[PDB]
């Protein structure tokens, strides 16, 4: 036997939680603003239907199939679906990807905590018109916290505050994970997910009331959701939608499979998975599209709305919005809520992105939950020093694991399960015990459409983003060693 989810609600709130921390409140509207505004819904909804939902259900079934046999991670689950030596090595990726993401994500999550503390106590720059006059003091503020050097220097010089807050952040993640699934992860989601919703609605209401001489939030929603179907001719818009889907549903990160391995043998996953995925989609379109960009376009105007979009999602949430809140009534408290929202949202994703390593140490190496959590914490905390001190090291990990990895591994899940294990055998496994059954239209979708989409996407990135700065070689060296480390642990699990 193993740990199990206590309630259907807690399972859904925990499953939906591991995608709200991926920054979709910033990620989605930026992608929508740069791919036809409201016309981006056609690629986004289709990618949500032809790629997201089928790959989501697939990850739910692979976890429950593995969890019934006591295996919450993919080095063992792949071996069940494909009795082969190549399947165990491919399974290492489903343990390597979430571990590498945690090595830099928890540190980023710690930024939101430290920024929430500084805003709460008022230790923020308070300017004083032009955007650079307002944005630059908060650019220095983030760069002084992270320790970004002034030039091409390879060394980061993070503040002691950022380091201490990172320690505190790791302590919070351990406190949730060391309690377990029901006592820890599920108890956290049932409380924080509703709190995130209430807190997000307040920001939405507070943003809709923004009025500056340069624009209104109505212009922000108008700019964000004005459709332009001329963009739909460009295949790049469809590339951005499918890749976006991997983040609204957290596909390929190894988190859905591990969380689903604690779903009991016959408990429903079809309806419970569709609800958690629908919760993810609506929460990022409504709440996410009503805060970040509307507040940005309202403050700077429609003239800078194009520049805000090209600036990117991360700059919007760590530079632009704090600078906007700085110039609004009660904005020091408003900035606290924004970073409090990002922290507690990210807290759902970090505990879920470290559970596969914990489940592996538990299921395959027979370690206690206490020792599995603390060893996982030690591996992540130690390795994060590479991200905290080496410039552009975060980017290198985010590229191999966060970008290419989840799309490559998502294609791997769909092939091992729906082709090698048997499509009919896989279809039985998904719809088994389902309160609602998957429509048979998704059979052709899972077997042909979704793998084709992921194959087209992988080649596009293999052509565009395949080709100085020797510090990335150190990062490549370290994450490759982590793969050798996990392969050795998988090997040690076979001997036991
Ligand atoms: C606590 C978590 C903070 C969430 C911030 C994530 C916002 C996403 O930000 C985007 O992420 C991409 C990679 O994922 C990068 O390539 C983009 O440059 C960046 O703008
Ligand atoms: C691998 C675990 C080792 C923990 C010790 C690492 C200490 C690095 O921490 C450093 O301590 C300095 C003290 O002034 C601070 O100025 C730096 O901001 C901080 O990065
Ligand atoms: C100054 C910041 C302190 C943060 C600590 C509280 C953060 C909220 O997190 C809580 O921490 C508790 C620690 O025991 C855990 O028991 C709870 O499970 C967890 O929800
Ligand atoms: C940030 C958006 C995602 C948060 C969604 C959490 C919504 C509250 O979550 C749950 O929804 C159920 C249906 O109303 C209620 O019965 C439960 O009391 C509540 O915990
Ligand atoms: C009493 C509860 C108030 C909820 C938050 C509202 C914050 C008010 O904020 C104010 O609202 C005005 C429009 O009414 C605008 O001029 C500005 O957005 C702002 O000055
Ligand atoms: C350096 C990585 C630490 C690995 C996790 C172990 C944390 C050490 O904690 C140990 O846990 C044991 C549990 O029985 C206790 O008996 C010990 O008193 C305690 O020191
Ligand atoms: C899982 C969330 C990933 C964190 C988002 C990345 C934020 C770190 O910073 C980002 O690094 C990127 C590297 O590609 C750059 O493209 C962005 O310009 C930069 O903002």
Author numbering: 4 to 131, 135 to 473, 479 to 507
Question: Which lines from the publication concern this structure?
Answer:
The intracellular side of the transporter is fully closed, while the extracellular side is slightly more open than for the outward-oriented, Na+/substrate-occluded state. At the unwound part between TM1a and TM1b, we observe a key difference to the Na+-bound forms at the substrate-binding site: Leu25, which is conserved in all NSS, has rotated due to a neighbouring flip at the polypeptide chain, and it now directs the side chain into the vacant S1 substrate-binding site. Indeed, no electron density is detectable for Na+ ions at the Na1 or Na2 sites. Importantly, the current structures show a buried Glu290 with no positive charges to compensate a negatively charged carboxylate (as opposed to the Na+-bound states) and an increased predicted pKA indicating that Glu290 is protonated and neutral.
